[PDB]
Task: inverse folding
RNA sequence: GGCCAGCAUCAGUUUUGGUGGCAGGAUAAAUCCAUAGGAAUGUAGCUUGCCUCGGUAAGUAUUAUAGCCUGUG
RNA sequence: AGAACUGGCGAUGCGGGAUGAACCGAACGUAGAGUUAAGGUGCCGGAAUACACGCUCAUCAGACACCACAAAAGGUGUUAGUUCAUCUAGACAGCCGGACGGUGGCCAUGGAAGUCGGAAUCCGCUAAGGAGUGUGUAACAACUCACCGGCCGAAUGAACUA
RNA sequence: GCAGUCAAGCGUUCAUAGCGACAUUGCUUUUUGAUUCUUCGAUGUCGGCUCUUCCUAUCAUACCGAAGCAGAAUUCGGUAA
RNA sequence: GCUCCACACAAUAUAGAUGGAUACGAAUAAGGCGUCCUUGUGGCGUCGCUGAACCAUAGCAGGCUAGCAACGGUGCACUUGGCGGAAAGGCCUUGGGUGCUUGCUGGCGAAUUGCAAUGUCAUUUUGCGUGGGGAUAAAUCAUUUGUAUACGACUUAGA
């Protein structure tokens, strides 16, 4: 109904800092820093007491309110990542041919590597995204633990990892082999 | 008002700037568009791609060579938007078209010349905020244009040269403003203030 | 990718006159076939009680 | 520093008691207070010190001047004129560079051709000293 | 049959190119530059 | 929401909401118990097994336990002193914070608190409670009891619940062909830690019921004294 | 141009054996007194068997707003005879005067329902004398204390075909 | 003695401004002036928890250290 | 399709619908000034990229004869309305617990315990709890839902019309 | 196709005055893959040699989902000329 | 004979001067300028709300002269160096020389075009003739070899 105004609170942890001049945003914290390009979304941040921020969308439609709510969600996600981080995990399994996933430094990009998937001779490679740091789970057989400050990078990396190993021309019910996500918890665990 | 008007192509809608330049040419005023690659178009880029692709499919059957042309350059594409707004088949249209000029970027000597913009053609003023819009250069690259990589380098070089020139102009204008302010409160200045100058 | 032909939007004068004749025929048919509670007070009106008296 | 910079979104929000300069119509060029809003596209302007009759007006026919002064909502024209005389907002508007440029262009429109010749003479005289000051520093 | 433009075969060829397929062209260009420098010295000597 | 609203569930269970009339019935019943019985009580029981509640109801034929929504019992007792059904009755409503649990009775006031002090029953971990005991799952094949009892009497866990072990319980269970198994002896919880809800769900799936339960009481009205008393026991 | 409220009166051409026929009155909104009398006859034909030949206009007068300057909420009964049969409708409007409220109502009807002025009917109009009698949220949002909203997209007009200043949206 | 135009005022057709006196409305309604009352999107004062030591939030307070509406003349 | 009457053409120019047997306008000597219709006022094309209020993102909308055959509805694409219900003795959604006992109800039998097969579907206590809405075992178990209770809080849900 | 039944809706009493979407009952040559060794007046021409071009309502090639797809092989559906 | 610099008169017309096409970039739910520090998505002040702006505009279509205040402003031919390749052909700049300077104050000519007739003031090109500079070739027809061909055409050879 073209609401006169709409806004949503954005709690700021005391250690976080988030300068905003243009619609472009930046965040800093003990775990590092992050940035985002929100110029397209057309929203106005407003600081109050350095412990909170109130994005606002005057005379917006319902779609604009949905854009403001997703903006607040992306900001809260960036804050949780710069404060708590994220620690994705992905178990992998095989029926007859053991998997041989291993990191490699090809071309300097720190390419991920996989071998002997379902007996295939092909060596698939899933390049690591910037920021996220691959590391095999300790004392946990057949597992890998992706982690990164941003949910987007680690999530896209896990998506590409589960997709690169997709089965083809075979019934899924019998062939359970393939990488799969196991957990999406924070790096702290327990804090 | 001036012998020529170097309108800037950045930020302008294709149809509005085309319709305004088509009338300005009929009045006999000269115009030379620049930075056509930056020209914007309403709607999301896929809509403009589907529209340009429909024009590309059409052609004469028995001899495609004599069929309609589909220029890929952004300047030629903007010219096609204006070519239909004028009666080019008439000699008056052939005369009005000669005054028109369009080029990607700001080739010299136009780079040193002053440039203007048409507020009615500006995307920022007519388009509603938050709406999607297509860039003419991206559509040109999608339709097979193969010079966007080249134009960007010359554009960055011209921007750096113009930035250094503006830095020198600011260093001069600061001293000019100081030389004007030191003359302030002079009785001639008081008379000019009483006269509105 | 490969755009397909779009239907013409042209008025098609022949089709215009034919649609006009079909409309006149449908109107004649609807006229020939023609031979064969108040809403109350709307809700949310501030002064519904005043109208009752 | 722990401060979270935010700069600045300093919108000229519409509000009761806002002064605004009409740009067209019989009331053009005259300030009027916004006694009360009517909707997103209308406001109850009131400019009794300027002599404009009170009437509703679309927001697109008028511009929001930065100056503001207190006004109770729904105030009668007498109280509005009293608050205008107390705030002396007209002096703040005349002090504003916008009103100064407006009066400057208005005086320029009325200039006599002999006044234009005197303006050209005084401008050349000022330009002589302004150019003599140049290069000497 | 896979198309000549098919992305899969092109990616496989791009992966194969990194090894001997590039090393052979590298050694060939090196030998060609060496023969060119030798032909230049043979002309400059006289 | 004119459009794009979430669809409501269309389940066709025979049951239907009792409506406000059931609340009015419980209100009239609480008023009848207030005007009939002399003593009144406000028990606090955040959770209780239904059979245990029936066993508490059958402990005496001389008393009644009119459970209901806390707001309904509060309005029956009077949200304020002006609204009280009986003198000083409003004070009894103020003390309640939790589930109640009202227990009108003609029995002597001492016997009720004594029976409450004596009553005690086993209960689940009830999260946000300190862990009753520390235990670890066997490193070998998992069993339906989780290894809390000797494996010779224990039976392997059914495969159908295995995916919940990986998703809800977070345990790194590995479903070996014949039986579910874990490569390492995962610990369910350390002693004295505040349980996570997933840990309580794990203890419930394993059947552990080490935690005890006993309904507490905070105060009792006395119609003869026309004043509430703040006696309490746990 | 602007709508003008009017009142109409009639007595159905008094005849023998019926001295002083009972008077009737109906407020009407119309651009001119002729259209107001036409709508009055059209309403009398529906609510009575009488006809314009059978009656006459006992009086006609404009009804100016008692306090045109004052802001006022205005609920309005409405019914439009399309596409289906007529049905009751209601809408709130914040307008300085009843005539401007009727004009905004006619515009909103022609927009959101494509109703023509011939189909629209104004069974009743009344001010909302007190706060919280308003129901729909779109009027309630303007009632908030010390309300203030911006106009971020101030697209200034430019009479010149060209503008060397590259105008900004400020605000 | 011929060809082309300007100027001043005139006859008909006609277009666009300035400006003055009148008739009509509820003898316009407003605004404004005095008054009898009402309320909050509660004005001053007072009261309650807070605290960067004084503004918040809710009760009172219908004009008080702002004001609004209704009817009357 | 078969009859009557009113009209254009035939014999008809002119302006507009890009043109057209029918559409709208319209009383055809040669010209000037002036005022108009249909139809338009971004360019071709003479005229405002006028004013004020509402809806539209369409992966070829729309400017279409569209008050006509496809046209009955389907869209969790939008906006405004009508009706029926709940509510600070707590509205929707959100997270946790209960979801009881004759009972493993009566008929098929290597086995159906609510959920492989048939006819009923109550009492007992509750705030509530269904001889059971679904997932799953050989059965059980277990998970879960209809409804209640535990925590924040206030407007929320359904059917139709435009 | 013919005859019939309930009604989500419509319509002055009101569906039972009348209609009515989506469904449904009885027939068109046999319930034991038995038969089906029926093929029944096109009054008018359609069909073929070289060869260009266009469409999807896609046989195949290319990419995908489902199907008792363990494999192979196969069916449908989406894009794709 | 040809080509470059000017001037002497012509013809040729202009898609149409009758002061100046006055140069940062990006965004428009943001910015230009000045200042300051802790140099940053920093603090403060200032400004738009249009170019209705800035320079220049006085002298016979812009004369002949006398001085005053400063060593500025500016046309012309030289002259030092640098930058510009997207269609650069353009810009900045050092040193004097030579004119004007309405920055300021004075001495004369304007007439008769008769009450206006755009009342002629710009270049695109071309020729002759002047006076100051610079050097003295190609293609085709024809014959002829073929890497080619219907003829045309293509590729080579011959002082």
Result:
């Amino acid at each position: 109904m073209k609401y006169i105004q709409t806004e949503q609170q954005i709690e700021v942890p005391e250690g976080v800092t988030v300068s905003i001049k243009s619609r472009i945003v930046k965040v800093v914290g003990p775990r590092g820093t992050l940035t985002k390009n929100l110029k397209h979304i057309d929203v106005t941040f407003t600081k109050v007491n350095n412990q909170l921020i109130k994005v606002a969308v005057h005379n917006g439609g319902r779609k604009h309110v949905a854009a403001l709510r997703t903006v607040k969600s992306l900001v809260d996600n960036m804050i949780t990542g710069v404060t708590k981080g994220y620690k994705y995990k992905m178990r992998y399994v095989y029926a007859h041919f053991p998997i041989n996933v291993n990191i490699v430094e090809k071309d300097g990009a720190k390419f991920i590597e996989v071998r002997n998937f379902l007996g295939d001779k092909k060596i698939r490679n899933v390049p690591v995204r910037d920021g996220v740091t691959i590391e095999f789970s300790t004392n946990v057989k057949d597992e890998i633990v992706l982690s990164g400050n941003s949910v987007e990078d680690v999530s896209q990396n896990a998506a590409d990892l589960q997709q690169i190993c997709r089965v083809r021309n075979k019934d899924i019910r019998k062939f359970l082999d393939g990488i799969y996500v196991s957990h999406k918890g924070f790096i702290t665990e327990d804090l | 008002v001036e012998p020529v008007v170097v309108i800037d192509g950045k930020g302008h809608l294709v149809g509005r700037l085309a319709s305004v330049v088509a009338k300005q040419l009929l009045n006999g005023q000269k115009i030379v568009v620049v930075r056509a690659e930056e020209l914007n178009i309403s709607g999301e880029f896929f809509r403009n791609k589907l529209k340009y692709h429909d024009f590309l499919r059409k052609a004469t059957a028995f001899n495609k060579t004599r069929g309609p042309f589909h220029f890929r350059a952004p300047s030629r594409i903007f010219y096609k938007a204006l070519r239909g707004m004028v009666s080019h088949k008439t000699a008056r249209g052939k005369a009005a078209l000669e005054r028109l000029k369009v080029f990607e970027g700001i080739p010299p000597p136009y780079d040193k010349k002053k440039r203007v913009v048409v507020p009615q053609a500006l995307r920022v003023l007519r388009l509603k905020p938050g709406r999607k819009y297509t860039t003419l250069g991206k559509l040109s690259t999608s339709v097979g244009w193969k010079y966007e990589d080249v134009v960007a380098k010359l554009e960055a070089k011209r921007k750096v040269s113009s930035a250094e020139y503006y830095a020198k102009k600011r260093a001069f204008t600061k001293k000019v403003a100081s030389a004007n302010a030191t003359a302030a409160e002079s009785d001639v200045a008081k008379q000019l203030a009483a006269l509105g100058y | 990718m490969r755009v397909r032909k779009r239907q013409s939007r042209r008025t098609s004068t022949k089709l215009k006159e034919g649609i006009k004749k079909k409309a006149s025929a449908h109107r004649k048919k609807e006229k020939k076939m023609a031979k064969k509670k108040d809403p109350g007070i709307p809700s949310n009106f501030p002064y519904k009680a005043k109208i009752l008296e | 520093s722990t401060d979270s910079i935010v700069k600045a979104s300093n919108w000229r929000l519409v509000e009761v008691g806002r002064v605004v300069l009409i740009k067209k119509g019989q009331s053009a060029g005259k300030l009027a207070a916004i006694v009360e809003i009517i909707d997103q596209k209308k406001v109850l302007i009131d400019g009794p010190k300027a002599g404009v009759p009170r009437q509703a007006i679309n927001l697109g026919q008028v511009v929001l001047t930065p100056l503001t002064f207190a006004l109770p909502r729904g105030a009668r024209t007498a109280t509005v004129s009293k608050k205008w005389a107390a705030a002396a907002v007209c002096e703040k508007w005349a002090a504003s560079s916008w009103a100064k440029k407006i009066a400057q262009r208005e005086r320029r429109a009325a200039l006599t051709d002999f006044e234009r010749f005197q303006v050209m003479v005084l401008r050349k005289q000022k330009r002589y000293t302004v150019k003599k000051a140049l290069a000497k520093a | 049959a896979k198309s000549l433009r098919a992305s899969s075969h092109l990616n496989a060829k791009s992966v194969k190119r990194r090894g001997v397929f590039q090393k052979a062209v590298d050694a060939r260009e090196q030998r060609i530059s060496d023969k060119l420098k030798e032909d230049l010295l043979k002309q400059k000597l006289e | 929401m004119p459009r794009s609203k979430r669809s409501k569930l269309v389940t066709l269970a025979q049951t239907d909401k009792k409506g406000r009339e059931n609340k009015e019935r419980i209100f009239d019943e609480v008023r009848e118990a207030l005007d009939t019985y002399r003593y009144v009580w406000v028990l606090h029981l955040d959770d209780v097994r239904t059979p245990v509640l029936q066993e508490i109801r059958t402990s005496w034929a001389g008393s009644k336990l009119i459970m209901g929504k806390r707001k309904v019992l509060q309005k029956a007792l009077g949200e304020k002193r002006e609204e009280e059904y009986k003198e000083n009755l409003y004070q009894l409503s103020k003390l309640c914070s939790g589930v109640t649990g009202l227990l009108f009775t003609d029995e002597d006031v001492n016997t009720v608190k004594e029976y409450f002090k004596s009553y005690v029953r086993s209960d689940y971990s009830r999260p946000n409670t300190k862990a009753p005991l520390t235990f670890t799952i066997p490193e070998g094949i998992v069993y339906s009891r989780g290894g809390q009892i000797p494996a010779e009497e224990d039976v392997p866990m059914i495969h159908s619940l295995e995916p919940t072990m990986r998703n809800k319980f977070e345990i790194p269970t590995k479903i070996k062909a014949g039986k579910i198994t874990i490569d390492s002896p995962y610990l369910v919880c350390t002693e004295g830690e505040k349980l996570d809800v997933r840990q309580a769900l794990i203890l419930k799936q394993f059947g552990i019921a080490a935690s005890e339960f006993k309904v507490k009481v905070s105060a009792y009205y006395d119609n003869d004294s026309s004043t509430v008393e703040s006696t309490n026991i746990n | 141009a602007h709508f003008k409220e009017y009142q109409v009166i009639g007595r159905r051409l008094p005849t023998e054996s019926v001295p002083e026929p009972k008077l009737f009155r109906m407020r009407i909104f119309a651009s001119n007194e002729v259209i107001a009398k036409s709508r009055y006859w059209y309403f009398l034909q529906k609510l009575h068997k009488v006809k314009k030949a059978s009656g006459e206009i006992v009086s006609i007068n404009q009804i100016n707003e008692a306090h045109p300057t004052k802001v006022k909420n205005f609920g309005v009964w409405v019914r439009y005879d399309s596409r289906s049969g007529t049905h009751n409708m209601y809408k709130e409007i914040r307008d300085v005067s009843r005539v401007a409220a009727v004009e905004t109502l006619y515009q909103d009807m022609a927009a959101r329902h494509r109703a023509r002025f011939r189909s629209i009917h104004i069974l009743k109009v009344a001010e909302i004398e007190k706060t919280a009698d308003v129901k729909r949220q779109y009027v309630k949002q303007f009632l908030t204390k010390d309300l203030k909203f911006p106009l971020p997209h101030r697209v200034q007009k430019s009479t010149k075909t060209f503008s060397y200043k590259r105008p900004s949206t400020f605000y």
The domain at 69-145 of chain G is CATH 3.10.20.10 (Ubiquitin-like (UB roll)). Chain G is about 20% helix and 25% strand. Residues 78, 80, 82-84, 87-91, 103-104, 106-115 of chain G lie near RNA strand I (CB under 10 Å from a C1').
